[PDB]
Amino acid sequence: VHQVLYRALVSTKWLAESVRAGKVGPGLRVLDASWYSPGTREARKEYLERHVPGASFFDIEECRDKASPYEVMLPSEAGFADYVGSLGISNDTHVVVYDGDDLGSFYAPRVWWMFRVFGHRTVSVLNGGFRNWLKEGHPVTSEPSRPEPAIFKATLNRSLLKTYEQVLENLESKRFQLVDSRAQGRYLGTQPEPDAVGLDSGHIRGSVNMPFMNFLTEDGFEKSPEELRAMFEAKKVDLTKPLIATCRKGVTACHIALAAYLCGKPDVAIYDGSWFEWFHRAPPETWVSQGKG
Ligand SMILES: O=C(O)CCCC[C@H]1CCSS1
């Protein structure tokens, strides 16, 4: 976020050179933000086995409001600050974040947005993810990264965040386009919502659906700005108008913010409670499912 936008995307080549130049340290910290559904892949063990040299593991399980009923909700400012500071990240650190998802990117945009919603703009996503780091035979190690702790000051940037009450008001004001990044079946209500008890699928009334995976090429790279721009247009999403991205739990919604950011729109707000909180708090009349409800 800013007028001149920071490079939201860093290439593997760039990161490889910076690592051989011995640049990771207080000025450049790398984070593996991988998280996968319980029982599929083991994000921390994978990290411990192979990570880019000097990278730390960003634990989204830790860095969240553990007291919330809802899923992966932001920590407080102090919480974020202490966590990120123990990872050796200061306000001066360029933070590069990747994950090891097979699609090339899944949680890394969420952590990109987390740094940005806590006021830190020098954060980038590794374009192609650890998948392409690996595919290109770049250096990996199991060596422990033990950064010196740093002090980090986190300041919540409220316009990059939307709450329940704000999305509810928007049902009436319609001043924000609400774009849902979940896969089409979950949006339409034909596919069930995974990993929850008694959670129906469907979508908030008035949402447009832009499945996050459509922003990535088959190789795991971000599509070019041109292709992105065309996708928003084909979906009637106007990038000059307010946009709130939502999804299941505030995570893939960040892909809509990253893609919009690469198209010159820095201010997509994330409905962090997303469908998981919406279903649980909203009147049934505010959403629709093609399998009715
Ligand atoms: O996305 C699907 O349809 C399958 C379930 C995968 C779970 C994660 C993806 C988006 S919410 S958690």
Short mmCIF file of C-alpha atoms and ligand atoms in Angstrom, two decimals:
data_model
loop_
_atom_site.label_atom_id
_atom_site.label_comp_id
_atom_site.label_asym_id
_atom_site.label_seq_id
_atom_site.Cartn_x
_atom_site.Cartn_y
_atom_site.Cartn_z
CA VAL A 1 0.00 0.00 0.00
CA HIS A 2 1.21 3.62 -0.77
CA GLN A 3 0.86 5.62 -4.07
CA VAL A 4 4.02 4.13 -5.59
CA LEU A 5 3.45 0.48 -5.03
CA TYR A 6 6.15 -1.74 -3.64
CA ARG A 7 7.14 -4.82 -5.63
CA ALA A 8 4.58 -7.27 -4.44
CA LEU A 9 6.23 -10.09 -6.44
CA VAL A 10 9.92 -11.14 -6.22
CA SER A 11 11.28 -13.82 -8.62
CA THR A 12 13.07 -16.92 -7.55
CA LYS A 13 16.13 -15.67 -9.48
CA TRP A 14 16.17 -12.51 -7.47
CA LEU A 15 15.90 -14.36 -4.18
CA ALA A 16 18.61 -16.87 -5.17
CA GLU A 17 21.05 -14.08 -5.97
CA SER A 18 20.24 -12.22 -2.72
CA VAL A 19 20.87 -15.40 -0.72
CA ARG A 20 24.25 -16.07 -2.45
CA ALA A 21 25.15 -12.42 -1.85
CA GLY A 22 24.61 -13.09 1.87
CA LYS A 23 21.85 -10.50 2.02
CA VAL A 24 19.32 -12.23 4.29
CA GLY A 25 19.72 -10.80 7.72
CA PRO A 26 18.09 -7.76 9.46
CA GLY A 27 17.33 -6.16 6.06
CA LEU A 28 15.91 -9.23 4.25
CA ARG A 29 14.02 -11.94 6.07
CA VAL A 30 12.31 -14.79 4.30
CA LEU A 31 9.28 -16.58 5.60
CA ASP A 32 7.70 -19.85 4.78
CA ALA A 33 4.00 -19.25 5.50
CA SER A 34 2.79 -22.75 4.55
CA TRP A 35 -0.32 -24.13 6.19
CA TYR A 36 -2.35 -27.08 4.85
CA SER A 37 -5.48 -28.85 6.12
CA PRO A 38 -4.85 -31.23 9.02
CA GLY A 39 -3.94 -34.59 7.64
CA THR A 40 -2.75 -33.62 4.19
CA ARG A 41 0.75 -32.00 4.30
CA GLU A 42 2.84 -31.01 7.32
CA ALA A 43 3.89 -27.42 6.87
CA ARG A 44 6.37 -27.11 9.80
CA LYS A 45 8.05 -30.48 9.15
CA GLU A 46 8.49 -29.64 5.46
CA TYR A 47 10.00 -26.34 6.48
CA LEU A 48 12.41 -28.06 8.89
CA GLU A 49 13.48 -30.36 6.05
CA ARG A 50 13.94 -27.82 3.31
CA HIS A 51 13.70 -24.08 3.45
CA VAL A 52 15.54 -21.33 1.58
CA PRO A 53 18.75 -20.67 3.58
CA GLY A 54 18.05 -18.24 6.45
CA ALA A 55 14.21 -18.49 6.12
CA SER A 56 12.05 -18.74 9.27
CA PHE A 57 8.69 -20.46 9.58
CA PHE A 58 5.77 -18.07 9.97
CA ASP A 59 3.19 -19.98 12.00
CA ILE A 60 -0.34 -18.78 11.11
CA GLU A 61 -1.68 -20.99 13.88
CA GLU A 62 0.31 -18.94 16.40
CA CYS A 63 -0.06 -15.51 14.89
CA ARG A 64 -3.81 -15.11 15.14
CA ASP A 65 -6.47 -14.14 17.63
CA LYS A 66 -6.62 -17.43 19.43
CA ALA A 67 -9.54 -16.16 21.54
CA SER A 68 -11.85 -15.72 18.51
CA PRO A 69 -14.54 -18.32 17.68
CA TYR A 70 -13.72 -17.80 14.00
CA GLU A 71 -10.94 -18.94 11.79
CA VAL A 72 -7.58 -17.28 11.26
CA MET A 73 -8.45 -13.93 12.55
CA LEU A 74 -5.80 -11.21 12.93
CA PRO A 75 -3.81 -11.07 16.20
CA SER A 76 -3.74 -7.76 17.99
CA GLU A 77 -1.00 -5.27 17.13
CA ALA A 78 1.08 -6.32 20.14
CA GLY A 79 0.70 -9.96 19.23
CA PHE A 80 1.83 -9.45 15.67
CA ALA A 81 4.66 -7.20 16.76
CA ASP A 82 6.15 -9.59 19.26
CA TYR A 83 5.87 -12.58 16.98
CA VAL A 84 7.38 -10.91 13.92
CA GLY A 85 10.01 -9.21 16.07
CA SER A 86 11.17 -12.65 17.42
CA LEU A 87 11.63 -13.67 13.78
CA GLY A 88 14.22 -10.83 13.48
CA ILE A 89 11.94 -8.59 11.42
CA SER A 90 12.03 -4.90 12.11
CA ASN A 91 10.16 -2.05 10.42
CA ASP A 92 13.15 -1.84 8.06
CA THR A 93 13.06 -5.42 6.91
CA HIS A 94 12.09 -6.34 3.37
CA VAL A 95 10.03 -9.48 4.14
CA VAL A 96 9.79 -12.11 1.39
CA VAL A 97 7.11 -14.75 1.94
CA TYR A 98 6.49 -18.01 0.17
CA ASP A 99 4.57 -21.20 0.82
CA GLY A 100 4.98 -24.67 -0.65
CA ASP A 101 1.45 -25.09 -2.07
CA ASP A 102 1.17 -27.21 -5.25
CA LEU A 103 -0.65 -24.38 -6.98
CA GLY A 104 2.41 -22.14 -6.36
CA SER A 105 0.65 -19.91 -3.86
CA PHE A 106 -1.97 -20.22 -1.18
CA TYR A 107 -1.13 -18.72 2.28
CA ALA A 108 1.72 -16.45 1.21
CA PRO A 109 -0.81 -13.68 0.01
CA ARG A 110 -2.48 -13.83 3.45
CA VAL A 111 0.82 -13.07 5.23
CA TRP A 112 1.62 -10.41 2.59
CA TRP A 113 -1.67 -8.75 3.48
CA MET A 114 -1.05 -9.24 7.25
CA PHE A 115 2.18 -7.25 7.11
CA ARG A 116 0.37 -4.62 5.05
CA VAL A 117 -2.67 -4.41 7.37
CA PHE A 118 -0.22 -3.94 10.28
CA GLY A 119 1.44 -1.07 8.43
CA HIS A 120 4.53 -2.67 6.86
CA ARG A 121 4.76 -2.13 3.12
CA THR A 122 8.13 -3.79 2.24
CA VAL A 123 6.78 -7.30 1.85
CA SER A 124 6.77 -9.42 -1.24
CA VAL A 125 5.54 -12.85 -2.29
CA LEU A 126 7.98 -15.22 -4.00
CA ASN A 127 6.41 -15.58 -7.48
CA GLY A 128 6.11 -19.30 -8.25
CA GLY A 129 6.42 -20.24 -4.56
CA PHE A 130 8.70 -22.83 -3.07
CA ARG A 131 7.38 -25.14 -5.87
CA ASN A 132 9.37 -23.18 -8.47
CA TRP A 133 12.34 -22.51 -6.10
CA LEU A 134 12.65 -26.25 -5.98
CA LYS A 135 11.91 -26.82 -9.67
CA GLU A 136 14.83 -24.54 -10.54
CA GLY A 137 17.27 -26.33 -8.21
CA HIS A 138 17.93 -23.33 -6.04
CA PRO A 139 19.66 -23.84 -2.60
CA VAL A 140 17.66 -25.43 0.23
CA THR A 141 18.87 -26.41 3.76
CA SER A 142 17.64 -27.88 7.01
CA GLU A 143 20.14 -25.65 8.92
CA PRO A 144 18.33 -23.88 11.81
CA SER A 145 17.73 -20.17 11.19
CA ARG A 146 18.13 -18.38 14.55
CA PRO A 147 17.71 -14.61 13.78
CA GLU A 148 18.64 -11.97 16.36
CA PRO A 149 15.28 -10.64 17.80
CA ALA A 150 14.29 -7.25 16.55
CA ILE A 151 11.68 -4.77 17.78
CA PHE A 152 8.75 -4.23 15.37
CA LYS A 153 6.02 -1.61 15.75
CA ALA A 154 2.71 -2.76 14.27
CA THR A 155 -0.08 -0.25 13.48
CA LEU A 156 -3.39 -1.60 12.23
CA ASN A 157 -4.46 -0.09 8.92
CA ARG A 158 -8.22 -0.29 9.32
CA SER A 159 -9.16 0.37 5.65
CA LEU A 160 -7.54 -2.89 4.53
CA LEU A 161 -9.84 -4.80 6.89
CA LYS A 162 -13.60 -5.33 6.99
CA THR A 163 -15.69 -6.69 9.86
CA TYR A 164 -19.08 -8.35 9.97
CA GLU A 165 -20.98 -5.12 10.72
CA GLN A 166 -19.33 -3.42 7.78
CA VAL A 167 -20.12 -6.16 5.27
CA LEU A 168 -23.71 -6.23 6.68
CA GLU A 169 -24.07 -2.44 6.11
CA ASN A 170 -22.69 -2.98 2.59
CA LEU A 171 -25.62 -5.33 1.83
CA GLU A 172 -27.72 -2.27 2.06
CA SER A 173 -25.37 0.45 0.81
CA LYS A 174 -23.84 -1.61 -1.98
CA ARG A 175 -20.90 0.80 -1.99
CA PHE A 176 -18.31 -2.03 -2.19
CA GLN A 177 -18.21 -4.84 -4.76
CA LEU A 178 -17.86 -8.06 -2.75
CA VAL A 179 -15.76 -10.62 -4.52
CA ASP A 180 -15.60 -14.15 -3.23
CA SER A 181 -12.44 -16.12 -4.02
CA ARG A 182 -13.74 -19.60 -3.09
CA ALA A 183 -14.05 -22.31 -5.72
CA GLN A 184 -17.21 -22.03 -7.75
CA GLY A 185 -19.06 -25.01 -6.23
CA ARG A 186 -18.61 -23.68 -2.69
CA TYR A 187 -19.73 -20.26 -3.81
CA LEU A 188 -22.78 -21.64 -5.58
CA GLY A 189 -23.66 -23.93 -2.67
CA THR A 190 -23.37 -27.13 -4.70
CA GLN A 191 -20.10 -28.25 -3.03
CA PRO A 192 -19.95 -28.44 0.82
CA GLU A 193 -17.75 -26.30 3.02
CA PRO A 194 -14.88 -28.50 4.36
CA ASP A 195 -13.57 -28.87 7.89
CA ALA A 196 -16.49 -27.42 9.92
CA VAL A 197 -19.64 -28.64 11.74
CA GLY A 198 -22.95 -27.58 10.30
CA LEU A 199 -21.53 -24.94 7.92
CA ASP A 200 -23.54 -24.65 4.66
CA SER A 201 -21.98 -23.31 1.50
CA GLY A 202 -23.42 -20.59 -0.66
CA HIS A 203 -22.51 -16.96 -0.76
CA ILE A 204 -23.37 -13.61 0.63
CA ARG A 205 -26.08 -12.00 -1.40
CA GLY A 206 -24.58 -9.79 -4.10
CA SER A 207 -21.12 -11.45 -4.17
CA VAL A 208 -19.33 -12.00 -7.51
CA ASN A 209 -17.23 -15.18 -7.67
CA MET A 210 -13.58 -15.07 -8.73
CA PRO A 211 -11.97 -18.43 -7.75
CA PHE A 212 -8.45 -17.61 -6.58
CA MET A 213 -6.81 -20.38 -8.59
CA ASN A 214 -7.70 -18.64 -11.83
CA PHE A 215 -5.08 -15.96 -10.93
CA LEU A 216 -2.24 -18.49 -11.26
CA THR A 217 -0.87 -20.06 -14.45
CA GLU A 218 -0.53 -23.87 -14.64
CA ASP A 219 3.11 -23.44 -13.62
CA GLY A 220 2.32 -21.70 -10.28
CA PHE A 221 3.20 -18.18 -11.37
CA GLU A 222 1.00 -15.14 -11.09
CA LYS A 223 -0.75 -14.32 -14.40
CA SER A 224 0.47 -11.12 -16.07
CA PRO A 225 -1.31 -7.81 -15.17
CA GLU A 226 -2.89 -7.88 -18.59
CA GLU A 227 -4.52 -11.25 -18.04
CA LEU A 228 -5.54 -10.23 -14.49
CA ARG A 229 -7.13 -7.02 -15.72
CA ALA A 230 -9.04 -8.96 -18.36
CA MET A 231 -10.33 -11.43 -15.70
CA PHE A 232 -11.68 -8.66 -13.48
CA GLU A 233 -13.38 -7.16 -16.53
CA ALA A 234 -15.00 -10.42 -17.70
CA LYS A 235 -16.44 -10.81 -14.18
CA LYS A 236 -17.88 -7.22 -14.24
CA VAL A 237 -15.56 -6.27 -11.39
CA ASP A 238 -14.58 -2.71 -11.80
CA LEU A 239 -11.14 -1.96 -10.34
CA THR A 240 -11.91 1.70 -9.91
CA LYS A 241 -14.73 0.95 -7.48
CA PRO A 242 -14.42 -0.17 -3.78
CA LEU A 243 -13.87 -3.93 -3.42
CA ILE A 244 -14.01 -6.23 -0.44
CA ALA A 245 -12.61 -9.72 -0.96
CA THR A 246 -14.08 -12.52 1.05
CA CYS A 247 -13.81 -16.27 1.01
CA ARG A 248 -13.92 -18.97 3.72
CA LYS A 249 -11.60 -17.54 6.40
CA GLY A 250 -9.86 -14.42 5.08
CA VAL A 251 -7.01 -16.32 3.43
CA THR A 252 -7.52 -16.91 -0.36
CA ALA A 253 -9.42 -13.60 -0.43
CA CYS A 254 -5.92 -12.08 -0.21
CA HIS A 255 -5.22 -13.43 -3.73
CA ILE A 256 -7.87 -11.00 -5.00
CA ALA A 257 -6.05 -8.21 -3.13
CA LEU A 258 -2.62 -9.25 -4.57
CA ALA A 259 -3.95 -9.52 -8.14
CA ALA A 260 -5.75 -6.18 -7.80
CA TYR A 261 -2.55 -4.66 -6.32
CA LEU A 262 -0.58 -5.88 -9.37
CA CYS A 263 -3.21 -4.13 -11.49
CA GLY A 264 -2.59 -0.83 -9.65
CA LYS A 265 -5.39 -1.16 -7.02
CA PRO A 266 -3.73 -1.20 -3.51
CA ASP A 267 -6.86 -0.92 -1.40
CA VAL A 268 -8.87 -4.16 -1.62
CA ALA A 269 -10.06 -4.76 1.95
CA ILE A 270 -10.26 -8.29 3.33
CA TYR A 271 -13.35 -9.45 5.16
CA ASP A 272 -11.28 -11.39 7.71
CA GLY A 273 -14.26 -13.22 9.33
CA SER A 274 -15.35 -14.25 5.81
CA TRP A 275 -17.98 -16.96 5.18
CA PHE A 276 -17.12 -18.80 8.37
CA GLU A 277 -18.09 -15.82 10.51
CA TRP A 278 -20.87 -14.69 8.17
CA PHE A 279 -22.78 -17.96 8.29
CA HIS A 280 -22.49 -17.94 12.06
CA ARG A 281 -23.65 -14.39 12.68
CA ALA A 282 -25.76 -13.25 9.75
CA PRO A 283 -29.54 -13.69 9.20
CA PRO A 284 -30.09 -16.60 6.65
CA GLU A 285 -31.85 -14.10 4.40
CA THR A 286 -28.48 -12.47 3.63
CA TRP A 287 -27.05 -15.37 1.67
CA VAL A 288 -28.07 -17.78 -1.07
CA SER A 289 -27.26 -21.35 -1.94
CA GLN A 290 -28.32 -23.03 -5.20
CA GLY A 291 -28.93 -26.08 -3.03
CA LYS A 292 -31.33 -23.58 -1.25
CA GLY A 293 -30.05 -23.54 2.41
O1 LIG B 1 -11.23 -25.66 -2.10
C1 LIG B 1 -11.85 -26.72 -2.12
O2 LIG B 1 -12.88 -26.85 -2.75
C2 LIG B 1 -11.34 -27.94 -1.36
C3 LIG B 1 -11.01 -27.79 0.11
C4 LIG B 1 -9.63 -27.20 0.26
C5 LIG B 1 -9.63 -26.47 1.57
C6 LIG B 1 -8.94 -25.12 1.54
C7 LIG B 1 -9.27 -24.32 0.27
C8 LIG B 1 -10.08 -23.04 0.46
S1 LIG B 1 -10.75 -22.92 2.14
S2 LIG B 1 -9.50 -24.24 3.01
#
